[PDB]
Amino acid sequence: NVAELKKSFNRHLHFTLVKDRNVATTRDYYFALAHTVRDHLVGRWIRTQQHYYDKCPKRVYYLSLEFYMGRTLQNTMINLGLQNACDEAIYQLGLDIEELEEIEEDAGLGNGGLGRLAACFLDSMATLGLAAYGYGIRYEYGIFNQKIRDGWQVEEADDWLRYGNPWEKSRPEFMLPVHFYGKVEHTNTGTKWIDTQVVLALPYDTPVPGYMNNTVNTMRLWSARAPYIQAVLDRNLAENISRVLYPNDNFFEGKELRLKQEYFVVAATLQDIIRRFKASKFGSTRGAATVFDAFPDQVAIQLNDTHPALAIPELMRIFVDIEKLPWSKAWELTQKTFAYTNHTVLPEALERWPVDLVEKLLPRHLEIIYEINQKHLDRIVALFPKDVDRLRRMSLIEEEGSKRINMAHLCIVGSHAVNGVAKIHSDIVKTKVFKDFSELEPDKFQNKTNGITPRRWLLLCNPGLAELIAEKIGEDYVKDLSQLTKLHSFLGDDVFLRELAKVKQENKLKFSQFLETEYKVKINPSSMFDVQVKRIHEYKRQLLNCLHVITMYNRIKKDPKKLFVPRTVIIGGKAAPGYHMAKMIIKLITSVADVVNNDPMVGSKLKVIFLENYRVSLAEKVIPATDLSEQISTAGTEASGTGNMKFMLNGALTIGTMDGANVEMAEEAGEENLFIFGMRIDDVAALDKKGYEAKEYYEALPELKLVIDQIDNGFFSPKQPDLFKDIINMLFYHDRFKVFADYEAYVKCQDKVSQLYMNPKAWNTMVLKNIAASGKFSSDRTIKEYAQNIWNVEPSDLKISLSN
Amino acid sequence: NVAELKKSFNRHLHFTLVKDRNVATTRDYYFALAHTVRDHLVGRWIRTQQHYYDKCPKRVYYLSLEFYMGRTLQNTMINLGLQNACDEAIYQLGLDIEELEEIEEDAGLGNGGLGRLAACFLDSMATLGLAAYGYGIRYEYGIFNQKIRDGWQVEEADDWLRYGNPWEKSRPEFMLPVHFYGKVEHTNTGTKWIDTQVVLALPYDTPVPGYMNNTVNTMRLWSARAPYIQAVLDRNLAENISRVLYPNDNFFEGKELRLKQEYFVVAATLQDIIRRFKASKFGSTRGAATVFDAFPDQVAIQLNDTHPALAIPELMRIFVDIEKLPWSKAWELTQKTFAYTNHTVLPEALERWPVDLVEKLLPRHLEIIYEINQKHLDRIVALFPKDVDRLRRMSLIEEEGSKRINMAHLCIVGSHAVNGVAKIHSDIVKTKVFKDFSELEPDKFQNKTNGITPRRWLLLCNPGLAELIAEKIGEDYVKDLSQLTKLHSFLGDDVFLRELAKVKQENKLKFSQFLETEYKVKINPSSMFDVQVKRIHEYKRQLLNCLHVITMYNRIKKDPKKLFVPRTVIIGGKAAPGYHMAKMIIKLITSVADVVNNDPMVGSKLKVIFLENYRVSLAEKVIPATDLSEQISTAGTEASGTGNMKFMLNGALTIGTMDGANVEMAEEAGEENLFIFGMRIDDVAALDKKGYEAKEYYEALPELKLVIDQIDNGFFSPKQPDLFKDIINMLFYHDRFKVFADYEAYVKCQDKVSQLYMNPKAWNTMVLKNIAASGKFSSDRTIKEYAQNIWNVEPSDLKISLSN
Ligand SMILES: O=C(NCC(O)N(CCO)C1CCCC1)c1cc2cc(Cl)ccc2[nH]1
Ligand SMILES: O=C(NCC(O)N(CCO)C1CCCC1)c1cc2cc(Cl)ccc2[nH]1
Ligand SMILES: CC(=O)N[C@@H]1O[C@H](CO)[C@@H](O)[C@H](O)[C@H]1O
Ligand SMILES: CC(=O)N[C@@H]1O[C@H](CO)[C@@H](O)[C@H](O)[C@H]1O
């Protein structure tokens, strides 16, 4: 209760932080609170893991190079049902829990959607009571902190562990060795991988609390550690493996250090998984072969993209070289164990490691990969005697010039299930990208539409909305989001609609406070919050948005008195350090913003803000305060998107193309309840066939012309007129994302948005239909499908009893 | 009470280690116990520091690059008076208290005597209730762990922080920036140190519990931290500053990284000291010049050797460049603040940094050093118009060829007190080494004979002896070691003498168990334990000991039946990685040992063991089991020695030269109660004048000849006959430590030792006189002198009611 919590807080402030109320810092208070809450996880964490051992349910291992977790404090309190009591305790202690919460560093061990999906999945799996484990890397530095200097992005090291992470638990007794380089000998006692350099893998466990169910799963993250002065200093080399997260989103960078990270997670993970298996005492541990026949019935490993592809040849290595199992058997058990999820579209995102590199670092794995390919191709040849080109198409090796390994191909042949993350995407993957494989193995390919956890992305980030909905339809929706359809009953309820708007109103107010204390700008709280937050990339097209912003600005100047719905345009996101065009687009946006925000004639009519350091904790703030969600990727480029789901769940209307999950959002809530626009996948194809001539649009649309000329002649960069020539050049001759092609339809759609915004009742009526139809987008629904059609496991509804 | 301790232990095992009795590891139990004990320090640590703030007593800052702390668990329990109660709790919990304690890593942030003295001082100052602070570096890696492979020393990284250090407390809010490189600007506003690279200094506090007095002082250790991928990885460079402890004992290695460590500690320390001064509510602090007038009355900084010499020019820099104080005033306050302790007269040990290096790394400090020197020399010139050479002799700069800074000279002119660590040593420092300075400033030089804490080095390491003594004379001796003189009353008490021998007997038994489980050898528990443990160095002469060992071996072979007192010769210690001769001497010893231990004719008559990885925790084991302590440094080379004091306190007889504190040990217990031998300081001088011709001894002493020929011809290295030619060459033509010169007298003394050993009553009667006269060697006595004659502080003796 409140009294015991205050007592605990004081106890930790004293014994754990070694402070008293007159000397304690804000960070000390945060730590005291964190520990007070953390103590409540222990009992259930221990019992949960003990339960999995006793009952031996099939376990799920989500293997990923990224886990975009954000902060843990508030999420733990909520899932533990502790928030209001801690709220009261901290208040009575004379402190502000909200300020204590801001002390916590984000666990930004991810780039964006891919990493955040893993995070949402862990929460859902814990809530569904599944015996699930998250396996990743404990990066000393996560996604860099972003600063904006003189309009340009500036990176700063994310030293998130500097003062200690109370949410992680070092597990010394489970340390393991990982091998690199060396050579291989095929002796008469099996093949041996020798002369290798060893790097220790130290696991750190972080509790994953299920929502109100006594289940507490585990996220195990590995850190690299080394097994006269210069020699000691050189231990840094081994430790560099888990030093930093590669800041690339949808872009493959074949650096050797990255390959080392991939094998690192994979090696430690699989060895730890096998150790756990061989300790489970599973039905008859009979020596030597020790069964392992039940391994696939007790273990499921999901490959989050191809980053951990090496897991396949690594399991084979363990089964064959160490466990001495016959190849055919090992391969069988291997396919039954692995499942691969594809999240990529762009050619530049595909992982293709040159063989030479892999030969040097992982000689034994290259051999195993060649053997897998050999057996793979033999069969195709067996099935298609007269189709030579089919062989080069399906091989795991691309021989043309420099030889490379197609990691996706390896994942496909080593897994019993391959899934995309959205209907439109899964179809492209199955019928186009991997047509040669799906024809041969139809039933292998599936779709699993992404989802987001309604705990973090609703109960946590928008308590006001969560409360309002609960009051009307009960709390059942938290565990069964489809229940939101009940909200349809209030479609004509004016009072409800009024209450809905107030909540949004309240969120916008709180966020506007944030905006003003952070940026010199003054926000019109009456303005429509137009938001586009996500990683900066050309396919995302924040550039298209920028064109519309300039378009709006030019309209205001031309007619300073016309009827206009005021807007606050917010665009945020990080650009990969080496992504030149992305960095230029940021400076463009900041440039435009400086002109827009300071032009006296526009004044409070329109404000532009480049939201700095967009990350999970910040997302939890801006999303709830949004009116219009920008999801404008070129049709066919956004595999799924998840930010789109968060905005929909939080009371915002969507403006976007028929791409990724946007299509299913339209399916669920009705197309007229979303502002869809632009080319669709078939249109983009026709354009590519006919040939994209950007100038065409430029010379045919005056509003666009003025925008482009202004950018190109220096209207937004007077002291440096040709700053954006790179953007111009790409926009006119190398824009593979057809920005000008969707401009007109985009601007026309935008005007429609404004019209609806003038009608509060109609706007909120559409909002309600969106929220009421967002149920399918709960990651709980996603995981159920995975569990049922891929992992072959079963959700459990129980509860770790405590007192008596 | 025992019940609450068990309750607390279980609480921590659960909430802190996240384990239960069936899954907990030994490490986990150690941590649970460590936390249970640690909680007992909190109340008093907070109140002690609060008290210093409220009463504002003058503070003492012991600035050192080393603190050889050893383990903390047992020492804390003993000083807090909790050992029996905890011992009981662990027992009732079915746990082996011993096994838990062995889990703890030594905090080996020191090389040997210098670092251990700092550690003993912290304990004494806390016990004397002084407002003292230890300031050093938190090395990620301390003195390397030593292994012996194929008879040779092998180094392994001391990764002591790998699983966490419960005894340290990160103090985030006190982080500070340290500057390097850059350049000096001579502006209209004084000199500015611009364009520097910054390294953050993160302080970590470790509690220092006084013995049974409620006082808990602080040891604050600093760690370096950095303020695309390659850039992130390169943060390792800044962090390398506090990465490893330079493993040199009495040897100067002028590496740039070492210079960086020295400035690092100094910069962070002084800035933190000034910050604290400013916040101490003191007689109104105007501004600009926060007066600092009272700084010297509130602050005392002891320079542990010249390693932190930069502290002098750093304080001046702060006073002048930042606090804007006039030079004359700053210099005055500076001298009143600093005191310098000289810990060695060995030439190769003297710190002399080349100016070029200092100019590059610390340009502003080089300027300040030149100015100090200029004002220094001007005066000498003023006082000695006609003594030019006196100027080159007293200058802080040695211009001859490559220019260097004499750091000891800098420390002398910047301090109001300079002390040696033993009468014989302090005299050499004052009348010879720094004659030019002492004549000018007589009263500046002092002596402060070293000491060791009777807690760690008696109550902790030898509970049996401590108990026996307590039973006879009470427990008062712990806080007043001079009380041991009371033991003189039992000089003729046979029963007591018998009890004394039993205790030694028990220690030798326990240690013999250790020796056998670690080394294949079989120990004759009836043998005299002849021990020489300390860092390997030529001036220490473990080589001379080795010659005697070979001498004894050759006697056994020649007359396998003669009456002989059996001996177990133990020699241990680490050699600096780059000290070639030291490493050869180790291989020699291990070589000789292999021959001796396996020669059938000698059998149990004599056994030789090279004690591996000699360190504080191991010292606590071997010392209590010793019968004969080897302290045989060449007269005039061991400034003081402290190991000698530990052996004396623990029931062992000393064999040694009149060097360091050996002389005062002889003074205290009577020269006939110590086996003194060899050349004295005046003799070594005569020999140096006449010229040392080693061959002389070789051709005149047959026993030595056989020994040398055997070493030189390969008797101890058959498969490699000329392995020791380096030792031979140094022994005949470059032995500046006169090994052959003391050989005869040494061997003759050794025989005397054996004779006495045959008379148990006479031997233990001498032992009692030694123990009864070791009181002056308590570090409590040492600190009192420092406090009274240098720091001008007062040991406040009492106890503050806990929370009753
Ligand atoms: O880190 C924890 N305890 C401290 C610890 O384990 N430890 C030893 C690590 O090996 C410390 C004692 C000395 C310094 C490091 C820790 C406890 C805990 C409990 C939950 Cl529910 C979740 C995460 C957790 N981490
Ligand atoms: O380290 C301690 N507490 C933990 C802590 O301070 N902390 C924040 C460090 O900035 C942890 C919480 C999250 C992980 C690290 C600590 C407490 C303590 C008490 C005494 Cl008497 C002596 C040493 C000590 N160290
Ligand atoms: C490689 C990569 O980052 N892919 C991203 O993955 C997430 C999660 O599946 C998708 O929603 C998103 O559209 C896609 O761009
Ligand atoms: C430079 C150095 O490490 N000096 C050492 O200091 C200790 C502590 O004063 C002395 O006992 C010892 O004789 C001396 O060799």
DSSP letter assigned to residue B105 = P
- Whether B142 has its CB under 8 Å from any CB of chain A: the answer is no
Closest C-alpha residue for ligand 1 atom 18: A169
Question: Does ligand 4 have an atom closer than 6 angstroms to the CB of B117?
Answer: yes
| Beta pairing class for B352-354 and B404-406 | antiparallel
Burial label for A153, CB within 10 Å (0-12, 13-18, 19+), is buried
Instruction: Report the 3 state secondary structure along B60-121.
Output: EEEECCCEEEECCHHHHHHHCCCHHHHHHHHHHCCCCHHHHHHHCCCEEECCCHHHHHHHHH
Strands B152-156 and B352-354: unpaired
Q: Is A61 annotated as a binding residue?
A: no
Instruction: Give me the long-range contacts of B497-501 (CB less than 8 A, separation at least 24).
Output: B497/B761, B497/B764, B497/B765, B497/B768, B499/B468, B500/B468, B500/B651, B500/B764, B500/B767, B500/B768, B501/B760, B501/B764
* CA distances (Å), origin A331, targets A218, A397, B260: 28, 19, 56
Q: Which of B269, B441, B262, B449 is nearest to B343 (CA)?
A: B449
A535: Cα separation from own chain's centroid: 11
CA angle, corner B774, sides to B771 and B780, nearest 5? 135
Nearest CA to ligand 1 atom 15: B164
B660 lines ligand 4 (CB under 6 A): yes
Query: Rounded to the nearest whole angstrom, what is the distance from the C-alpha of residue A204 to the centroid of ligand 1?
Result: 10
Question: Taking CB atoms and an 8 Å limit, are A27 and B257 in contact across chains?
Answer: no
How far is Cα A136 from Cα A302, in angstroms, rounded to an integer? 12
Judged by its nearest atom, the ligand closest to the C-alpha of residue B204 is: 2
Which residue of chain A is at minimal alpha-carbon distance from B154? A228
Closest-CA residue to B790 (of B494, B373, B415): B415
Distance CA B495, CA B768 (A): 13
Q: For residue A597, what are its two tokens?
A: 């925000």
Both tokens assigned to A509: 């107010």
- Separation of alpha carbons B131 and B125, rounded Å: 8
Which residues form ligand 1's pocket by a CB distance below 6 Å?
A: A 38, 41-42, 45, 167-170, 172, 207; B 16-18, 31, 163-166
Q: Is the CB of B209 under 6 A from ligand 4?
A: no
- Helix, coil or strand: residue B607: strand
Question: Residues A586-601, buried b or exposed e (16+ Cβ, 10 A)?
Answer: bbbbbbbbebbbeeee
The bound ligand whose nearest atom lies closest to the alpha carbon of A537 is 3
Give the residue range(s) of CATH 3.40.50.2000 domains in chain B: 1-451+779-802, 452-778
DSSP string, A743-802: HHHHHHHHHHHHHHHT-HHHHHHHHHHHHHT-GGGBHHHHHHHHIIIII-----------
Whether B126 and B215 have beta carbons less than 8 Å apart is answered as: yes
Helical packing angle, B327-337 and B363-383, nearest 10°? 90
Residue B540 is among the residues annotated as catalytic for this protein: yes
| CATH (one of 3.40.50.2000, 2.40.50.180, 2.60.120.10, 3.40.50.1010) for A1-451+779-802 | 3.40.50.2000
Q: Does A229 touch chain B (CB under 8 A)?
A: yes
Q: Give the residue whose CA is nearest to atom 24 of ligand 1.
A: A169
Active-site choice (B58, B307, B404, B540)? B540
Q: Which chain A residue has the Cα nearest residue B224?
A: A162
Does B170 touch chain A if contact means CB atoms closer than 8 Å?
A: yes
With CB atoms and an 8 Å threshold, state whether B243 touches A226. no
Decide: helix, strand or coil at residue A360.
helix
Cα nearest neighbour of A255 on chain B? B229
3 state DSSP class of B528: strand
* Residues in chain B, total: 804
Give Cα separations from A123 to A455, A640, A697, A797 (angstroms).
8, 20, 46, 15
Q: How far apart are CA A425 and CA A246, in angstroms?
A: 25
Beta bridge partners of B137: B222
B3 touches chain A (CB under 8 A): no
Tokens representing B201?
A: 């200094």
Mark whether B343 is an active-site residue. yes
Burial class (CB in 10 A: 0-12, 13-18, 19+), B619: buried
The rounded distance, in Å, linking the Cα atoms of A530 and A218 is 38
**What type of residue is A483?**
Q
Residues of chain B positioned with their CB less than 8 A from the CB of A163: 170, 172
Query: Among residues B67, B72, B174, which one has the least CA distance to residue B122?
Result: B67
Hey, how many other C-beta atoms are within 10 angstroms of the C-beta on B489?
A: 12
Distances (CA, A) of A213 to A44, A78, A80, A623, B737: 10, 12, 8, 27, 76
Which residues share a beta bridge with B169? B205
Resolution (A): 2.1
Report the residue among B12, B16, B165 best suited for mutation to probe ligand 1: largest number of ligand atoms under 8 A from its CB: B16
CB contacts < 8 A, A to B, total 80
* A21 interfacial to chain B (CB closer than 8 Å): no
The reply to whether A244 touches chain B by the CB within 8 Å rule is: yes
Q: Give the helix, strand, coil percentages of chain B, each rounded to 5.
A: 50, 15, 30
Report whether B340 contacts B303 (CB < 8 A): yes
CA separation for the pair B277, B318 (Å, rounded): 13
Q: Which residue has the tokens 């390169």?
A: B234
Which residues of A belong to the active site? 343, 534-535, 540, 642, 646
Structure determination method: X-ray
Does residue B774 contact residue B653 with C-beta atoms inside 8 Å? Answer: no
Please tell me the distance between residue A601's alpha carbon and the centre of ligand 2 in angstroms. 56
Task: Indicate the SS3 state at residue B285.
Answer: coil
How far apart CA B273 and CA B174 sit, in angstroms, is 11
Give the count of beta carbons closer than 10 Å to the beta carbon of residue B718: 11
Structure-token pair, residue A352: 């293709």
Sheet holding B606-611, edge to edge: B606-611, B567-572, B528-533, B628-631, B653-656, B675-676
| Choice among B646, B738, B769, B776 that is catalytic | B646
CA of B224 to the centre of ligand 2 (A): 19
Q: Are strands B299-304 and B59-63 parallel, antiparallel or unpaired?
A: parallel
Place of tokens 């649009």: A697
Dihedral sign, Cα of residue B394, residue B397, residue B399, residue B403? positive
Contact between chains at A157 and B232 (C-beta distance less than 8 A):
yes
The answer to whether A20 is a known ligand-binding residue is yes
Ligand 3: list residues with CB < 6 Å. Answer: A 113-114, 117, 249-250, 305, 343-344, 349, 421, 450, 638-642, 660
Q: What is the 3-state secondary structure (H, E, C) of B216-252?
A: EEEEEEEEEECCCHHHHHCCHHHHHHHCECCCCCCCC
Contact indicator for B62, B305 with CB cutoff of 8 Å: no
Structure-token pair, residue A631: 């999801």
To the query of whether residue B642 is one of the catalytic residues in this protein, the response is yes
Beta strands B183-187 and B190-194, pairing class:
antiparallel
Q: Is A786 on the interface with B (CB under 8 A)?
A: no
A243: contact with B, CB 8 A cutoff: yes
Q: Which ligand is nearest to the CA of A111?
A: 3
Query: What would the two tokens of residue B111 be?
Result: 């090389």
Burial of B695 (0-12, 13-18, 19+ CB in 10 A): exposed
> What's phi and psi for B104, nearest 5 deg?
-60, 130
Contacts of B76 (CB under 8 A, 6+ apart): B37, B38, B40, B41, B82, B207, B209
Q: B240 and A240: CB-CB below 8 Å?
A: no
**3 state SS of B611:** strand
Q: How far apart are alpha carbons A172 and A201 in whole angstroms?
A: 10
Structure tokens at A637: 């480029």
Structure tokens at B627: 């019968």
Tell me the two tokens of residue A576: 């990969």
**Rounded distance between C-alpha atoms, residue A338 and residue A419, angstroms:** 12
User: How far is the C-alpha of B647 from the C-alpha of B462, rounded, in Å?
Assistant: 11
Beta strands in A244-286 (DSSP E): none
CA-nearest residue to A154 within chain B is: B228
Q: How far is the CA of B32 from the centre of ligand 2 (A)?
A: 14
Candidate from A42, A80, A169 with most ligand 1 atoms within 8 A of CB, to mutate: A169
Q: Is B578 on the interface with A (CB under 8 A)?
A: yes
DSSP string of A708-745?
HHHHHHTTT-TTSTTTTHHHHHHHHH--TT-HHHHHHH
Q: Which residues from chain A sit within 8 angstroms of residue B141, using beta carbons?
A: 232
- Residues A526, A493, A653: CA angle, nearest 5 degrees: 45
Helix (H, G, I), strand (E, B) or coil at A244: strand
The binding-site residues of ligand 2, defined as CB within 6 angstroms of any ligand atom, are: A 16-18, 31, 163-166; B 38, 41-42, 45, 167-170, 172, 207
Please name the CATH architecture into which domain B452-778 falls.
Answer: 3-Layer(aba) Sandwich (3.40)
Q: Collect all residues with Cβ–Cβ distance below 8 Å to B408 and sequence separation of at least 6.
A: B306, B309, B340, B342, B350, B351, B434
Q: Number of helices (H) and strands (E) in chain A: give both, helices first.
A: 32, 25
Give the sign of the dihedral formed by CA B476, CA B480, CA B486, CA B487: positive
Q: How far apart (Å, rounded) are the C-alpha atoms in residues B159 and B105?
A: 9
CB A118 within 8 A of CB A110: yes
As a whole number of angstroms, the distance between CA B763 and CA B755 comes to: 9
3-state secondary structure A10-43: HHHHHHCCCCCCCCCCHHHHHHHHHHHHHHHHHH
C-alpha dihedral sign at B434, B436, B439, B440 = negative
CB-based contacts of B611, cutoff 8 Å, min separation 6? B533, B570, B571, B572, B573, B618, B622
C-alpha B537: how far from its chain's center? 15
The neighbouring-strand residues paired with B572 are B533, B611
- Dihedral pair phi/psi, residue B352, rounded to 5°: -145, 90
